[PDB]
Amino acid sequence: VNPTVFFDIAVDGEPLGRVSFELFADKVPKTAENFRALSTGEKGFGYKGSCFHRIIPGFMCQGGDFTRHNGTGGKSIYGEKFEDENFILKHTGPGILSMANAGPNTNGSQFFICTAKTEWLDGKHVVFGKVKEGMNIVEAMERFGSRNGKTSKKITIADCGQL
């Protein structure tokens, strides 16, 4: 059965809500397992305490950089990077969960939640999940963003894990 993880989001330290994701381990098992193990911190590191450093309304909320907190760091459980598993799944609309990267086969820990349809990233970013509950909480994160991505308040993952 496809695993389910959750984020407890905080805005400048104040609780905001819970976002839960369905990870399509059946279709992208390696990518979904990385994200799952970073949400539980079972490898010693992960997402708990990291932030959403780049939020663009109408585009996507991006986070997952738990070593440099600005988009220049992060690492997977398999090493500093790992390959593109497949591009079966498409960026069909809001709620999609896809992996960020700096070129072919450079996936680490940085993901982005689509707040819109982003079909131009098909074949370039691996889709591996979707928001299951708390899409309202993601839309509340979006309003603390800006056209260039700098957030007006600190959006953090106060807690994460598996359900």
From Swiss-Prot:
Phosphoserine PTM positions: S76
Keyword tags: Acetylation, Apoptosis, Cytoplasm, Glycoprotein, Host-virus interaction, Isomerase, Isopeptide bond, Nucleus, Phosphoprotein, Rotamase, Secreted, Ubl conjugation
Domain of life: Eukaryota
A GO cellular component annotation in the UniProt record: membrane
N6-acetyllysine modification, residue list: K27, K43, K75, K81, K124, K130, K132
Covalent cross-link Glycyl lysine isopeptide (Lys-Gly) (interchain with G-Cter in SUMO2) as placed by the record, residue numbers: K27, K81
Modification sites for Phosphothreonine: T92
Stretches assigned to the PPIase cyclophilin-type domain: 6-162
Alphabetical GO biological process terms: activation of protein kinase B activity; apoptotic process; cell adhesion molecule production; cellular response to oxidative stress; endothelial cell activation; leukocyte chemotaxis; lipid droplet organization; negative regulation of oxidative stress-induced intrinsic apoptotic signaling pathway
Catalytic activity: [protein]-peptidylproline (omega=180) = [protein]-peptidylproline (omega=0)
Glycosylated residues, chain numbering: N107
Major enzyme class: isomerase
Subunit and interaction comment: Interacts with protein phosphatase PPP3CA/calcineurin A. Interacts with PRPF19 isoform 2 (via N-terminus). Interacts with isoform 2 of BSG/CD147. Interacts with FOXO1; the interaction promotes FOXO1 dephosphorylation, nuclear accumulation and transcriptional activity. Interacts with integrin ITGA2B:ITGB3; the interaction is ROS and peptidyl-prolyl cis-trans isomerase (PPIase) activity-dependent and is increased in the presence of thrombin. Interacts with MAP3K5. (Microbial infection) Interacts with HIV-1 capsid protein.
Protein name: Peptidyl-prolyl cis-trans isomerase A
Source organism (scientific name): Homo sapiens
Upper taxonomic lineage: Eukaryota, Metazoa, Chordata, Craniata, Vertebrata
